[PDB]
Amino acid sequence: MLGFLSARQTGLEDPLRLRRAESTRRVLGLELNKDRDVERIHGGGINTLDIEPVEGRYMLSGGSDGVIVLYDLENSSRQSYYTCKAVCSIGRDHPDVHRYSVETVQWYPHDTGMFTSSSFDKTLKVWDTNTLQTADVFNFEETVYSHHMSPVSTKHCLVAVGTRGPKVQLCDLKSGSCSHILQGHRQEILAVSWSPRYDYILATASADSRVKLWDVRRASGCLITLDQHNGKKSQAVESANTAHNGKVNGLCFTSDGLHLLTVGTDNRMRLWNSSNGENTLVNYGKVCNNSKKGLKFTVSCGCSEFVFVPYGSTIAVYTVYSGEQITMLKGHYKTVDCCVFQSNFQELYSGSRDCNILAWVPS
């Protein structure tokens, strides 16, 4: 590493080299945090986490008990040991608390003054973070499994919602219009994710073992349907062209948005060319998941790319483009529901059914 510093000082290597190499080295040295703790407030398992995209300081967490906790991750104390204190809380005494489990919570991109939370109580609530009051509510005829706002859209502010209905709802923040729907799936839509690269590209994964990419501006259904075999087993499109041999319960675009990682209940993760949906045939081995709802997993950013997938009661870290298994982060006592990656310091926060949020820091 002194070689890295010397090369940076002498201009031999771009500082990009040291930055990304050290980010990768930090991610590889991920371990149970020696001096860090997260305050425990959820009475039930944490189903979702979200660190705000700008300044990466505050973290939302939705629990199976319906409460939403807002933590400050910064060590505002002077000690080397600190607990990520809870700033705010939609608790059981809040007038607008979710009646059932919160399954997805997401900070509004471009601004930390608002966030959103969807629950199995058939509601997507939009909260003002300052007053901590519901600015808007979007009711659905069937329970919400996931939702996502575009991390890129300066123009549109649509929330793509996947419920147990076979339709992907698009709730417009502007002129409150939840009527827009996308047809083409056949069972519950367990995951939805906007492309970080393209403004109007949305990937949706449903229990019909299919993943569809939509240009929501378009009037002609999905753009691409992901196919495991790319055409080896080709059939008229009524039941073929499946992404997995089970329910596809997790989506994650890579950092650049040029590839898509789909995890399904066939104990398989697959990497897809996001421009034509071709399977890249990256192996990843066997990725154990049996979750009946959406599975939240994230990818690394700003490194020389990693994907952190909940794997039983562990976090499996894989190399996205080679599939090589890095490691198992092993500190949870029950199945891990979500993991969210802090890209500023290569940190990880994992929420599981054991009512714990565990922080993994580079050693």
Binding site: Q9, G11, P15, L16, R25, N75, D256, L258
Partner: protein
């Protein structure tokens, strides 16, 4: 909010890219050199390089390629900036005026994308059908050129190979074909695609992928007769044309990797190849009838470590170095009897990577003097930089009240100035100065009872003298006075002027024109003007005949610089100057382009105008205020051109470089008079008269910054000055290969005395690290203490600790073994320099690399890998831990002011630590919680902490319940340089404080604090100059200085780009008037001049 003023003391000198072509004209051969933000356009003459233009981009020039579209007469220049401003520039010369017009421009940044590892590649189709840009992984950006854009609308083609090493456009292809080496997990392969501009996608290339060397890193597209590509790898050079596959593995290129290449010929039968060691190879393609028969590589010789190299013509190669001085070398057909055909013709100074520096008030003056660890591996050196011309005096004669100096050739045969005439109050004094001997003698033909207003050598092997009463034309060869002219009314002469042919004398309000002829003084033109005369000059410029056709005068009570028609003494032009002080000096001089008229007042004001040989009309008035005393201007022809010396209480050498007037200081006390002198012993020497004596010195170069060079031949790393010992401690590093062997005699291996580290604490090519003690007068390596095997000396501090009186050199080291990523071992060694030897006074084995040390109130503050600890120096002379702080990723940079410690982290960016002395432990005052990767830190005030981010940004944090622990970045600024060092001090004798900084490219910049009043005024001017000055790539200044990182971008704030402000003097009056719409302009000249003085 904080108010800071950043300015460039030394422009970047490291050459990141150079191309050659016909840019300035269809017939000229240009060498365009990109230094980081400066673009230098040269013309390749038969000898050397004649600069024509130097423009400053608002951008780091990442790509630079010359291309000739169909129909274009001369090359256009494509520039891509690091911030991805693309522009196509054309050179349009309109007579005297030179412009760089932006034929097109745009911004090609994709909103997201992984910037590619190998870096920005920009290639152009040889038929100029498109520009390919590889900026990000997985994409290949295409800018079509047949479609004449003005916005360079660019489109991405998804490139399925995500790690492309290098790419070129192949030659002789029906369609634009790229050939690239890319890395996939199975190895490196060379693949080809054809780019289809209409389908906006790739198509199958002419020749299939080929599996190549593991480190194949360079692709050379070979011109049309051959076509195909040459892939240079670490160990082999391979050639591909689709069916032909030649390969050679010359052992001679195995020692180092080839990093730059260049095609010597137009048909590519020969290529120059530069490697990281500085060797220069010639790759030859031997043809057969046409196909290619075989490849050869031969080692031409050695150069500076080339970043880029260009073949100009006639064997002349420009070697562009980022790490050393760039070179202009020659390729001889035959060896120099030592195996090398390379012969260095010229060397261009490069303050290479300035890795550390100190400002030492060496010479015990009041002026700082930077001493920089510049350069790198073979090119390492210490550069000593000062803002002075450098009198370099050789003799003196204590003669008081010398009001006149003129060089004389008393010996007829000699053309040398071997005599000097002097006027003091009322008489004339001659000095012989034969060789080095100086004496006071009398020369025939001169009156010692009347003062000498002027005298000099003239044509016809004649001398001439203008005294207060008459003029005496001395016939040097035959005898004493034979032609003498006396004013008919016996009125005294008030002012005189003369040249090699003619004369113009002022008597009262009247002017007389005399022409010197053999044994004759003929009066022709005469007049009695409006007011008294003040100053005159008739020096012919671009004479070519023997006579000057113009005249310059200064008058009284109508303070103005007038021009006259010599044969008739009519009034040609008038520029009104004003004031209550009469003009004192008027001179007309050629400054690199044309004729300028320099007129000065008695208050140090000085006006330079652009004069014409036909009308005599002064244009582009610009005024500059030098000195607080009267000035006189004397002309001396140096090696290059004429340079004028403003003689005053602030003597200044005013010359022009790069077609602009830049003023160089001379740092002696005062200079009343000067005259040039070239005696048999004194070449191109001066003769500076002051009130007391006559100092006889030469001036080396007049470049504003004088740069000495102390070649170390090894990479220096740190430098600290020990005044009591009169030496610099310099940590150096040399690369030895095998037990081990030095590849060359470095300064460490050639010390007076030496020593080796014998420590009991810890029990290819490797870096040997030494502590060099360097004499601060002669800069010879007095001592070289070599450190342990596998020990990296990182930090070095000079200080005295505790209570003992000795001054110590304290070195912090780390143990580097290839099996590890972070040193776990390291030590702090305390040395004392005495009796020319370096004894080891103490040691302290620590458990990490000691990245930084600062002496902290008599205690030693070191930063071991992630812990910052304070050591006490016990009476026992050992270091004892006192307190620690552990809350860091890696404390790389430490600074101090009082009880506060600024810790720059590798990536948490600053933490204001306070050593609370009553308790004896550290306390985190505040922290900046942004993830800025630091390169240096500094403390400006009690509450301002400057930091340099690794993305070429400067930011200022300011000490702001728990939100009081958040330092606020109140200043943001994209510098465009990778700052390596901040240091308090200034190179010179409104603004508060002064922090110098050195960069990787060789910029030396200077940060200073402004007040709110000044800051507001200058920010408003900055906005208006952006509204007025037109940038080369039509880049916005605000965009250029916007704080930029891959995850953040903000407009600058709290920072004044002093460069943009100081460009306010380089604009003509109408544009200036536009700038200052809403107080008067001369007021802002006061401000900007006062700012440039810092």
């Amino acid at each position: 909010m904080s108010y800071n003023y950043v300015v460039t003391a030394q422009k970047p000198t490291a050459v990141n890219g150079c191309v050659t072509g016909h840019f300035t004209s269809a017939e000229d051969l240009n060498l365009l050199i990109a230094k980081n933000t400066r673009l230098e356009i040269y013309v390749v003459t038969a000898e050397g390089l004649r600069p024509v233009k130097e423009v400053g981009m608002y951008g780091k020039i990442a790509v630079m390629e010359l291309f000739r579209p169909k129909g274009e007469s001369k090359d256009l220049l494509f520039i891509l900036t690091a911030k991805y401003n693309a522009c196509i520039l054309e050179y349009k010369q309109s007579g005297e005026s030179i412009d760089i017009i932006t034929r097109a421009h745009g911004n090609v940044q994709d909103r997201i994308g992984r910037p590619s590892e190998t870096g920005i590649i920009g290639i152009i189709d040889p038929e100029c059908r498109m520009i390919g840009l590889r900026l990000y992984d997985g994409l290949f950006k295409v800018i079509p050129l047949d479609r004449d854009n003005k916005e360079l609308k660019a489109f991405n083609i998804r490139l399925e190979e995500l790690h492309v090493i290098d790419v070129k456009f192949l030659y002789g292809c029906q369609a634009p074909t790229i050939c690239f080496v890319y890395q996939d997990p199975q190895g490196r392969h060379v693949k080809t695609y054809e780019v289809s501009l209409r389908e906006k996608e790739f198509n199958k290339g002419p020749w299939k992928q080929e599996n190549v060397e593991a480190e194949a890193s360079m692709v050379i597209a070979v011109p049309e007769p051959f076509g195909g590509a040459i892939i240079i790898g670490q160990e082999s050079i391979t050639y591909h044309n689709g069916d032909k596959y030649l390969a050679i593995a010359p052992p001679i290129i195995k020692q180092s990797t080839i990093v730059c290449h260049n095609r010597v010929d137009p048909n590519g039968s020969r290529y120059l190849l530069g490697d990281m060691e500085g060797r220069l190879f010639m790759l030859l393609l031997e043809k057969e009838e046409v196909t290619l028969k075989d490849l050869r590589v031969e080692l031409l010789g050695e150069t500076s470590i080339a970043e880029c190299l260009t073949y100009l013509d006639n064997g002349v190669v420009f070697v562009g170095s980022r790490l050393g001085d760039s070179q202009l070398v020659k390729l001889n057909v035959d060896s120099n009897e030592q195996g090398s055909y390379v012969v260095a013709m010229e060397t261009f100074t490069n303050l290479g990577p300035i890795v550390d520096m100190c400002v030492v008030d060496l010479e015990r003056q009041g002026q700082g003097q930077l001493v920089t660890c510049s350069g790198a591996f073979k090119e390492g050196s210490l550069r000593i930089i000062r803002n002075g011309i450098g009198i370099h005096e050789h003799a003196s004669i204590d003669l008081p009240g010398i009001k006149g100096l003129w060089p004389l050739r008393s010996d007829p045969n000699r053309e040398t100035d071997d005599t000097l005439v002097l006027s003091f109050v009322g008489q004339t004094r001659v000095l012989m100065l034969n060789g080095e001997e100086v004496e006071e003698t009398e020369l025939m033909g001169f009156v010692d009872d009347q003062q000498t207003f002027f005298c000099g050598n003239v044509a016809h092997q004649q001398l001439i003298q203008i005294t207060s009463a008459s003029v005496r034309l001395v016939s040097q060869e035959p005898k004493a006075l034979v032609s003498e002219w006396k004013e008919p009314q016996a009125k005294n002469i008030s002012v005189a002027s003369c040249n090699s042919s003619q004369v113009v004398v002022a008597v009262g309000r009247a002017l007389y024109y005399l022409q010197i002829h053999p044994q004759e003084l003929r009066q022709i033109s005469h007049t009695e003007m409006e007011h008294e005369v003040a100053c005159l000059d008739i020096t012919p410029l671009g004479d070519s005949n023997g006579l000057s056709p113009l005249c310059a005068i200064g008058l009284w009570t109508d303070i103005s610089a007038r021009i006259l028609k010599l044969p008739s003494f009519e009034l040609l032009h008038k520029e009104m100057l004003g004031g209550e002080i009469i003009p004192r000096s008027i001179l007309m001089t050629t400054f690199e382009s044309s004729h300028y008229l320099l007129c000065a007042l008695g208050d140090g004001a000085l006006f330079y105008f652009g004069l014409n040989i036909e009308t005599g009309l002064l244009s582009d008035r610009k005024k500059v205020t030098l000195g607080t005393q009267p000035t006189v201007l004397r002309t001396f022809r140096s090696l290059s051109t004429t340079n004028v010396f403003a003689c005053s209480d602030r003597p200044t050498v005013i010359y022009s470089s790069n077609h602009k007037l830049v003023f160089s200081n001379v740092n002696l006390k005062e200079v009343n008079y000067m005259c040039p002198l070239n005696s048999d012993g004194y070449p191109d020497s001066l003769a500076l008269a002051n009130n007391s004596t006559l100092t006889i010195g030469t001036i080396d170069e007049i470049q504003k910054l004088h740069i000495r060079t102390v070649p170390l031949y090894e990479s220096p790393r740190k430098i600290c000055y020990q005044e009591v010992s009169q030496c610099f401690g310099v940590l150096s590093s040399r690369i030895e290969v095998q037990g081990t062997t030095a590849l060359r005699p470095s300064a460490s291996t050639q010390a007076l005395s030496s020593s080796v580290s014998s420590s009991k604490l810890f029990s290819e090519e490797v870096e040997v690290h030494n502590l060099l003690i360097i004499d601060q007068h002669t800069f010879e390596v007095l001592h070289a203490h070599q450190f342990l095997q596998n020990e990296y000396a990182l930090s070095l501090v000079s200080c005295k600790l505790g209570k003992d009186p000795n001054t110590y050199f304290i070195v912090g080291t780390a143990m580097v073994y290839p099996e590890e990523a972070e040193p776990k071992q390291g030590r702090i060694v305390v040395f004392q320099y005495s009796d020319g030897k370096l004894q080891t006074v103490a040691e302290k084995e620590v458990k990490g690399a000691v990245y930084s040390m600062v002496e902290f109130n008599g205690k030693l503050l070191a930063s071991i890998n992630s812990t910052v600890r304070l050591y006490e120096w016990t009476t026992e002379k050992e270091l004892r831990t006192e307190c620690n702080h552990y809350n860091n990723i890696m404390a790389l940079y430490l600074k101090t002011k009082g009880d506060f410690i600024l810790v720059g982290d590798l990536m948490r960016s600053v933490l204001l630590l306070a050593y609370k002395p009553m308790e004896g432990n550290f306390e985190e005052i505040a922290r900046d919680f942004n993830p800025n990767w630091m390169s240096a830190v500094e403390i400006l005030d009690d509450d301002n902490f400057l930091g340099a981010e690794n993305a070429f940004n400067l930011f200022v944090c300011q000490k702001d319940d728990e939100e009081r622990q958040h330092l606020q970045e109140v200043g943001l600024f994209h510098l465009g340089e990778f700052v390596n060092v901040f240091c308090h001090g200034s190179l010179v004798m409104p603004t508060q404080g002064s922090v110098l900084f050195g960069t990787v490219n060789g910029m030396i910049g200077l940060v200073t604090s402004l007040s709110e009043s000044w800051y507001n005024l200058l920010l408003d001017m900055q906005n208006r100059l952006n509204k007025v000055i037109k940038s080369v790539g039509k880049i916005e200044h605000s965009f250029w200085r916007s704080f930029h990182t891959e995850r953040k971008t903000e407009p600058a704030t709290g920072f004044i780009d002093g460069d943009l402000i100081e460009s306010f003097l380089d604009i003509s009056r109408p544009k200036m008037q536009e700038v200052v719409a809403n107080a008067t302009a001369d007021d802002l000249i006061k401000v900007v001049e006062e700012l440039t003085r810092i």
